[PDB]
Amino acid sequence: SVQIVYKPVDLSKVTSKCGSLGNIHHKPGGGQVEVKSEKLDFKDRVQSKIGSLDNITHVPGGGNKKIETHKLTFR
Amino acid sequence: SVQIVYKPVDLSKVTSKCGSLGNIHHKPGGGQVEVKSEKLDFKDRVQSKIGSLDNITHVPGGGNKKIETHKLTFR
Amino acid sequence: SVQIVYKPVDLSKVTSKCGSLGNIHHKPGGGQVEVKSEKLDFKDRVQSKIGSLDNITHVPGGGNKKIETHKLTFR
Amino acid sequence: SVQIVYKPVDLSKVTSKCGSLGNIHHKPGGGQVEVKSEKLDFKDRVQSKIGSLDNITHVPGGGNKKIETHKLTFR
Amino acid sequence: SVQIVYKPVDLSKVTSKCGSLGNIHHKPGGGQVEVKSEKLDFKDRVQSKIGSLDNITHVPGGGNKKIETHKLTFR
Amino acid sequence: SVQIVYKPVDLSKVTSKCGSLGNIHHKPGGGQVEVKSEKLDFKDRVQSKIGSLDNITHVPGGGNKKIETHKLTFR
C-alpha cells in the first residue's frame, strides 16, 4: 500500500575567514547608584538587582551557527 | 497505492571573509542613578533592576547563521 | 502494507579561520552602590543582588555551534 | 690618470602592515593644581608654565623613516 | 694610474606586520598638586613648570627606521 | 697602477610579525604632591619641575632599525 523514503542530502558549508579581530572595550560600570527606601510594604514575593549585573563581552573568533531540524510524523 | 520520495539536495555556502575588525568601544555606564521611595504598597509580586544591566558587546569574527527546517507529515 | 526509510545524509562543515584575536577590555566594576532601607515589611520570600554580579567575558577562539535534530514518530 | 664611478644601487623596502590601531587614550593632568604665593621677590627673568601643556598624542598609521646620505669628495 | 668603482647594492627589507595594536592608555598626573610659598627671594633667572607637561603617547603602526650613509673621499 | 672596487651586496631582512599588542597602561604620578616653602633665598639661576612631566608611552607596531654605514677613503 505505502512506501516512504526520506533522503535529504546536505553539503552546506557555513564559513568565515577573519584576518584580525582586536581592540574591543566595554565599560558598563563606573556610575554611582544611590537607592533609599522608607516605609515600604510587600505583600508578595520580590526580586531586586542593584549595581552592575549580567554584562557581557562575547567575542567568538568564529561565532557561526547552523540549525537543521528534520522531523517526520505518521498516522 | 502510494509512494513518496523526499530528496532535497543542498549545496549552499553561507560565507564571509573579513579582513580586519577593530576598535569597538561601548560605554553604557558612567551615569548616576538616584532612586528614593517612601510609603509604597505592593499587594503583588515585584521585580526591580537598577544600575547597569544586561549590556552586551558581541563581536563574532564570523557571525553567520543558517537554519534549515525539513518537516514531513502524513495521515 | 508499509515501508519507511530514513536516510538523511549530512556532509556540512561549519567552520572558521581567525588570524588573531586580541585586546578585549571589559570593566563592569568601579562604581559606588549605596543602598539604605528603613521600616520595610516583606510578607513573602525575597531575593537581592547588590554589587557586580554575573558579568562575563567569553572569548572562544572557535565559538561555532551546530544543532541537528532528527525526530521520527509513528502511530 | 683618474676614473671614479659611483653606482650605488638601492632596492630597499621599508614597510609596515598594521591591521587595526585604536582605543588609544591619554589624560595628562587629570588632577587638581593649586599654586599659592605670598611675598615673593624676583630680580631677574621669570618663566612659568602651569596646567596641562605641550602634551602629545602621535599615532602615525605608518611612521616609517628612511634616511640615505651620499657624499663624494675630491681634492 | 687610477680606477675607483663604488657599486654597493642593497636589497634589504626592513618590515613589520602587526595584527592589532590598541587599548593603550596613559594617565600622567592623575594626582593633586599643591605648591605653597612664602618669603622667597630670587636674584637670578627662574624657570618653573607645574602640572602635566611634555607628556607623550607615540604609537606608530610602523615605526621602522633605516639609515644608510655612503661616503667616498679622495686626495 | 691601481684598481679599487667596492661591491658590497646586502640582502638582509630585518623583520617582525606581532599578532596583537595591547592593553598597555601607564599611570605616572597617581600620587599627591605637596611642596611647601618658607624663607628661601637664591642668588643664582633656578629650574623647577613639579607634577607629571616628560612621561612617554612609545608603542611601535614595528620598531625595527637598520643602520649601515659605508666609507671609502684615499690619499
Side-chain angles (χ1 to χ4, degrees):
Chain A
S1 39
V2 172
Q3 185 176 352
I4 295 181
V5 177
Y6 188 113
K7 296 181 297 203
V9 189
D10 174 33
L11 300 97
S12 58
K13 73 182 216 168
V14 183
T15 296
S16 109
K17 184 106 58 49
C18 170
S20 48
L21 199 171
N23 306 340
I24 322 316
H25 175 289
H26 180 103
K27 204 259 257 205
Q32 301 187 350
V33 179
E34 176 152 22
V35 184
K36 287 174 168 149
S37 299
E38 298 195 8
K39 307 178 76 69
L40 312 190
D41 188 315
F42 293 93
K43 309 186 191 164
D44 204 345
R45 57 164 162 236
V46 50
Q47 306 194 352
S48 157
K49 301 182 160 167
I50 308 191
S52 332
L53 292 93
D54 319 304
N55 292 306
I56 302 185
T57 291
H58 180 258
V59 183
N64 300 306
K65 303 185 196 87
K66 162 161 174 62
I67 299 182
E68 189 171 5
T69 288
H70 298 255
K71 173 163 194 150
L72 166 52
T73 305
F74 195 113
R75 308 284 193 237
Chain B
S1 39
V2 172
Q3 185 176 352
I4 295 181
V5 177
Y6 188 113
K7 296 181 297 203
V9 189
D10 174 33
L11 300 97
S12 58
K13 73 182 216 169
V14 183
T15 296
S16 109
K17 184 106 58 49
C18 170
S20 48
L21 199 171
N23 306 340
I24 322 316
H25 175 289
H26 180 103
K27 204 259 257 205
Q32 301 187 350
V33 179
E34 176 152 22
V35 184
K36 287 174 168 149
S37 299
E38 298 195 8
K39 307 178 76 69
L40 312 190
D41 188 315
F42 293 93
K43 309 186 191 164
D44 204 345
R45 57 164 162 236
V46 50
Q47 306 194 352
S48 157
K49 301 182 160 167
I50 308 191
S52 332
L53 292 93
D54 319 304
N55 292 306
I56 302 185
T57 291
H58 180 258
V59 183
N64 300 306
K65 303 185 196 87
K66 162 161 174 62
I67 299 182
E68 189 171 5
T69 288
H70 298 255
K71 173 163 194 150
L72 166 52
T73 305
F74 195 113
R75 308 284 193 237
Chain C
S1 39
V2 172
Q3 185 176 352
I4 295 181
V5 177
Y6 188 113
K7 296 181 297 203
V9 189
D10 174 33
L11 300 97
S12 58
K13 73 182 216 168
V14 183
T15 296
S16 109
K17 184 106 58 49
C18 170
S20 48
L21 199 171
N23 306 340
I24 322 316
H25 175 289
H26 180 103
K27 204 259 257 205
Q32 301 187 350
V33 179
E34 176 152 22
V35 184
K36 287 174 168 149
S37 299
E38 298 195 8
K39 307 178 76 69
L40 312 190
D41 188 315
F42 293 93
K43 309 186 191 164
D44 204 345
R45 57 164 161 236
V46 50
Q47 306 194 352
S48 157
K49 301 182 160 167
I50 308 191
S52 332
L53 292 93
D54 319 304
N55 292 306
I56 302 185
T57 291
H58 180 258
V59 183
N64 300 306
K65 303 185 196 87
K66 162 161 174 62
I67 299 182
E68 189 171 5
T69 288
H70 298 255
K71 173 163 194 150
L72 166 52
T73 305
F74 195 113
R75 308 284 193 237
Chain D
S1 32
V2 181
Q3 300 189 15
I4 303 172
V5 178
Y6 191 110
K7 294 183 295 164
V9 186
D10 184 303
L11 301 97
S12 59
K13 77 171 198 177
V14 184
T15 301
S16 108
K17 189 107 52 47
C18 173
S20 48
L21 198 176
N23 306 349
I24 321 315
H25 176 127
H26 191 146
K27 250 259 279 189
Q32 164 193 339
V33 177
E34 179 158 286
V35 175
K36 292 183 154 161
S37 299
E38 295 181 3
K39 305 150 196 288
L40 315 184
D41 188 321
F42 301 81
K43 304 198 175 177
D44 202 346
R45 298 201 174 207
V46 168
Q47 308 197 352
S48 156
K49 298 176 191 174
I50 316 190
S52 272
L53 297 92
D54 319 304
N55 290 309
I56 304 172
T57 287
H58 179 218
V59 179
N64 295 307
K65 310 188 190 183
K66 161 165 177 57
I67 300 176
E68 190 177 2
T69 293
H70 292 258
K71 181 165 197 161
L72 171 52
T73 300
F74 190 105
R75 310 282 200 236
Chain E
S1 32
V2 181
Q3 300 189 15
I4 303 172
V5 178
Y6 191 110
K7 294 183 295 164
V9 186
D10 184 303
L11 301 97
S12 59
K13 77 171 198 177
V14 184
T15 301
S16 108
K17 189 107 52 47
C18 173
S20 48
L21 198 176
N23 306 349
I24 321 315
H25 176 127
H26 191 146
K27 250 259 279 189
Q32 164 193 339
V33 177
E34 179 158 286
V35 175
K36 292 183 154 161
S37 299
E38 295 181 3
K39 305 150 196 288
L40 315 184
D41 188 321
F42 301 81
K43 304 198 175 177
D44 202 346
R45 298 201 174 207
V46 168
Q47 309 197 352
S48 156
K49 298 176 191 174
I50 316 190
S52 272
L53 297 92
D54 319 304
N55 290 309
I56 304 172
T57 287
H58 179 218
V59 179
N64 295 307
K65 310 188 190 183
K66 161 165 177 57
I67 300 176
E68 190 177 2
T69 293
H70 292 258
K71 181 165 197 161
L72 171 52
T73 300
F74 190 105
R75 310 282 200 236
Chain F
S1 32
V2 181
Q3 300 189 15
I4 303 172
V5 178
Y6 191 110
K7 294 183 295 164
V9 186
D10 184 303
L11 301 97
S12 59
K13 77 171 198 177
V14 184
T15 301
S16 108
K17 189 107 52 47
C18 173
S20 48
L21 198 176
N23 306 349
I24 321 315
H25 176 127
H26 191 146
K27 250 259 279 189
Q32 164 193 339
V33 177
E34 179 158 286
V35 175
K36 292 183 154 161
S37 299
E38 295 181 3
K39 305 150 196 288
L40 315 184
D41 188 321
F42 301 81
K43 304 198 175 177
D44 202 346
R45 298 201 174 207
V46 168
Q47 309 197 352
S48 156
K49 298 176 191 174
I50 316 190
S52 272
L53 297 92
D54 319 304
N55 290 309
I56 304 172
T57 287
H58 179 218
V59 179
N64 295 307
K65 310 188 190 183
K66 161 165 177 57
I67 300 176
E68 190 177 2
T69 293
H70 292 258
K71 181 165 197 161
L72 171 52
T73 300
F74 190 105
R75 310 282 200 236

